[PDB]
Amino acid sequence: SAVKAARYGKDNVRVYKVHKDEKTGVQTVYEMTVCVLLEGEIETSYTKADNSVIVATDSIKNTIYITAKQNPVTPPELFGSILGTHFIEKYNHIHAAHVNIVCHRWTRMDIDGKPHPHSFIRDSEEKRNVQVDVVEGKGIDIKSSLSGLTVLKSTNSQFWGFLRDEYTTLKETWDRILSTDVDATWQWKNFSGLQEVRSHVPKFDATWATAREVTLKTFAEDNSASVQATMYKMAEQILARQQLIETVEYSLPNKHYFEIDLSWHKGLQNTGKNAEVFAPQSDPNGLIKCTVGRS
Amino acid sequence: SAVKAARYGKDNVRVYKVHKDEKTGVQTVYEMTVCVLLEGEIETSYTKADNSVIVATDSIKNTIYITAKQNPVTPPELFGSILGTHFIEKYNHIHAAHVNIVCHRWTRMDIDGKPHPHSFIRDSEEKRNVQVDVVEGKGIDIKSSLSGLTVLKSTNSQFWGFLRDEYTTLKETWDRILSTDVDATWQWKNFSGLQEVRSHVPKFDATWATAREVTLKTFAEDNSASVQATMYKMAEQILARQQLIETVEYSLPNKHYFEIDLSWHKGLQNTGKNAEVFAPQSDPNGLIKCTVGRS
Amino acid sequence: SAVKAARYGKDNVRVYKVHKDEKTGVQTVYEMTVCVLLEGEIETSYTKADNSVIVATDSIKNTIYITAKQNPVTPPELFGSILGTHFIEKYNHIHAAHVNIVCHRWTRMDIDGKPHPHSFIRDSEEKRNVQVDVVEGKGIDIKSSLSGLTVLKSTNSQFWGFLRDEYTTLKETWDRILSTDVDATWQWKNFSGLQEVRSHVPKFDATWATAREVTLKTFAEDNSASVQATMYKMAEQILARQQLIETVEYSLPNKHYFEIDLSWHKGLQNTGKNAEVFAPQSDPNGLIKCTVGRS
Amino acid sequence: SAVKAARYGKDNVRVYKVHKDEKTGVQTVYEMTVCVLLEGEIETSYTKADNSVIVATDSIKNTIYITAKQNPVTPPELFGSILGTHFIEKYNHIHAAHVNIVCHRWTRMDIDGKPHPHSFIRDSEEKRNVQVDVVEGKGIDIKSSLSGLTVLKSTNSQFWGFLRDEYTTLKETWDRILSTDVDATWQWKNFSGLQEVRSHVPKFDATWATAREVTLKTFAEDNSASVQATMYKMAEQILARQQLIETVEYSLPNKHYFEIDLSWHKGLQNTGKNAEVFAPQSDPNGLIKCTVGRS
Ligand SMILES: O=c1[nH]c(=O)c2nc(O)[nH]c2[nH]1
Ligand SMILES: O=c1[nH]c(=O)c2nc(O)[nH]c2[nH]1
Ligand SMILES: O=c1[nH]c(=O)c2nc(O)[nH]c2[nH]1
Ligand SMILES: O=c1[nH]c(=O)c2nc(O)[nH]c2[nH]1
Ligand SMILES: [Cl-]
Ligand SMILES: [Cl-]
Ligand SMILES: [Cl-]
Ligand SMILES: [Cl-]
Ligand code: NA
Ligand code: NA
Ligand code: NA
Ligand code: NA
């Protein structure tokens, strides 16, 4: 036998950083969870008990903290690029660094209508993430995403005209609930290295904001023919608004809310136009995916 | 042997309800998870296989839906009181109904600075809950709460002057991070029945808002001597602002953020006044509780 | 206002301990999660910022480790009693210690039909727990439990003869699936102190084993009239087999498995006597409870 | 823009099936969670609101139940192959079906030393899984796995000789705890279709058993130089014992257990050879991966 692929590192590294403005007293906090996995000429650690090729995962952890101390942690695309570049430059035999960052929300509190200088709220479990793959000789590949954005619309979703055969029981509808947890990813053009990533830094926060805004507005305003049709509209708009993105991918569950027929009880009418009370279904769920690129 | 206590019912009943304003087109959604457990002259179901005394848990589920269809589901204190009253009135042999409701957030979306008529976001996993105990001949006992309100302040928390002995390693501090998940409960005066609950309906949303506002403002503004001292201030203010509450209870974890000494690496200074990068600790956690009443 | 109740301490303290037999080489591992909350003359920490009365929660954590180092961690009833006694004896002003222990399974592996001296498997998420309340002047109150014991029987469960009215849709059945997650608690006679707890040490593991065995055998063998009737049989047997228990409490979800009518598809018969494929329901669930004592 | 990739279907479909032997009375249960995602000439559902190409996800759900009713659900490699083949054969325009199955444990209970005919226990959260990709014109690709197999050894793990530089603080060790959650995958040779899968049916359960046995024995017996070295030994043995496997992949967290220095308290010795009480660390964790193939 032989090693065909290998990577190793430290996962689930929780990191907080604070910035304190001396002049104003305003503090700003950042919290993330980081994973770094390395690849390179490491196969002998597996095949021959050769630990000399292993940068210890404990040392990878230390390096995450040190890097956070000495560099910006925002935008996460930048932090991940700095961190991954460090490993492939520092260690001759390490040839790729795969950096995943989950950013947690700490939104500044408003108290009596004024932003508070040092108090924050987790206003959502929605995350902003990056996957940064730094590959020696092949630049930096970045996938940015938002996930855990949970939404519901109570009308202006439809689903009719689907295939009907002997496996089909679903009734056509022209008015249903639609609820999902949005997972949206935008894949950047390959960057040649850290200098190029740094040259585009403002685009990272701007493109996250665009993706989020397009997602919410399109969800809210599209009289949806299907999850498929609505998500495609989101992707096409994001591509039209950032030329440095190559593809946009959505993965959307259809979190079903079922009508409840109560007519067996005193003729109570709770279906169709009279539907008021529904049963949210925990499982199963539709799962709809697509990757959209440029024509 | 003999039955000393018994209760039974249906848990984890997910319920959605929509209201549609015909004139304006504005829709409003409510989602909760409901548990109803009944007590009464039911011991023979346990001791003699006497199912005649059992209102089936499936029927309890049906009744939750029917009640939601025919009554307001908001405020949850009211819905729970209506629901619990139903069981003790409908069934001679059922003498108590214990209703727990967890309310999930569906906050109306703003799109282009305008509230959208039928689109919503789960803007937090924070919950609003009630426990409503309807006991035949003994009125209605209501505990209202908020939970899962996750906050962090980056300074203006202290902890010094605690007991120091041979088990103590903790260093005194005059400047630390404080983060918690707030669980706050206000216990209402006993209500004589449904009429009295209904007579106080506006106070339920108003008192939830007061509790939340006091919690956030006190957290943000108190230069905290301890979790103990800060939570007491919250409780005393809530009692002062709603005379129909008898007690306020807080349960607060101290979700620790530890400094990271990096001085072993090139003399990097990251402790005390120089602390920027911290290690959030998943466990263990302090857990601080108190119940405050009127003197 | 005034403090009506208060307790505080450290939660979620993970603890592992190993025993190494020098002669045989056999190692044995224990892992638990511990919570200790203290009560006493501590109100001024809440009302006056008086930290002098606070045994720091960090120190409580240290004390858990130290106590585990110097004493047996098994049975958990004993460890919790030692730990709680320490706090009320060491600190004049601390008058109660509430110790919760969750014990995690590390079952010795068999390799090639032989017990391995130092390798273990988590063979279940089933837990063994204790709640030990040590109250100065009032002895030691112990509740022992097993939880997370997940079982299913595919027949020999029935449910008929329940109340039927205008809220009832459930069909009577003489053959259904029954599945639950067992949470069973046995409450010991008050012990006067540590000496008395120690005098009964062998009874703790023996009574846990009895409770588990009775639960499994009764579940498997009872042609169940209801969850109520079956759980009562379990409780009565446990009381009959340990005189030092005062009560036994069960809390059992009825984790429903629904038939699926497939007759709309080519007349396929999958209900009643022909039921083969079922839909496990995540929610809602029946929840059935009782506390049984001696007549 | 244009669709570059798309798939859709139903996730989180819970399925139970019972087999009842009429002669013996012995019943046997199977429970799984199924996901089916389809690909094909479906792009117009995304780009033109063309639902005519959509086999409804509700219909996919129905089809899972129907298929389970009319075919074996074990081994999961077979069920997934039957299910995926159905979709690509039934629907001209569907060209791939991706079937994921998670199998849940229901192990027959022993009562008084005898296997019970219809009572079962969830004896572990360990799962057995398959990913079956049925691609029209390109056969059936199967990845089998076990996951959630949680183990610990208390000695006979080492880690020394790793790279040491200015980022390194980790001390070399010749005796540490090693604990992990095993995720192991074996990738089968491409099968030409259902007939070929069926021809190898006994190999599926046999190879799962081999993988599990090799994992446990190697974990228990290897005086481990690193997670890397130990996992490689497991993979090489599995490849040597099933020629129809092409690769074996492991993904192993290193779930750290840290020593606790207690020497600050009365000189208590709890490190090195005296280490008895440890602090299990929830995060971060090492994460070690490799894919092994034939030389
Ligand atoms: O938007 C939807 N897309 C689908 O593919 C689908 N299939 C259903 O059964 N419902 C659905 N709703
Ligand atoms: O606010 C705090 N209260 C406490 O009781 C405590 N104990 C610590 O170790 N830290 C603490 N911080
Ligand atoms: O064992 C059962 N006990 C109950 O109280 C019950 N109620 C149902 O609807 N099903 C039930 N099954
Ligand atoms: O088995 C191990 N492999 C590693 O790569 C590693 N790195 C550490 O810091 N510890 C480790 N233990
Ligand atoms: Cl769907
Ligand atoms: Cl604390
Ligand atoms: Cl039930
Ligand atoms: Cl590691
Ligand atoms: Na390199
Ligand atoms: Na009554
Ligand atoms: Na005392
Ligand atoms: Na096809």
Tab-separated table of C-alpha atoms in Angstrom, chain A residues 6 13 27 33 103 105 110 126 128 144 146 202 211-212 218 235 238 255 279:
chain	number	residue	atom	x	y	z
A	6	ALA	CA	-2.887	13.038	3.531
A	13	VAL	CA	-9.505	26.442	17.604
A	27	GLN	CA	-13.818	48.550	21.708
A	33	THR	CA	-13.373	29.104	15.157
A	103	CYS	CA	-16.910	33.891	12.168
A	105	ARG	CA	-21.612	37.360	15.389
A	110	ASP	CA	-27.625	49.889	21.217
A	126	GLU	CA	-25.814	32.982	11.240
A	128	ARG	CA	-19.748	34.122	7.874
A	144	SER	CA	-16.469	32.748	1.023
A	146	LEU	CA	-22.752	32.779	4.694
A	202	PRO	CA	-12.338	45.950	0.559
A	211	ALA	CA	-24.629	38.303	-1.265
A	212	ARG	CA	-26.609	38.727	1.948
A	218	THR	CA	-34.845	38.034	-3.686
A	235	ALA	CA	-26.850	33.536	-7.915
A	238	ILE	CA	-24.403	38.133	-7.258
A	255	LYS	CA	-38.212	23.164	5.702
A	279	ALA	CA	-47.434	21.774	11.671
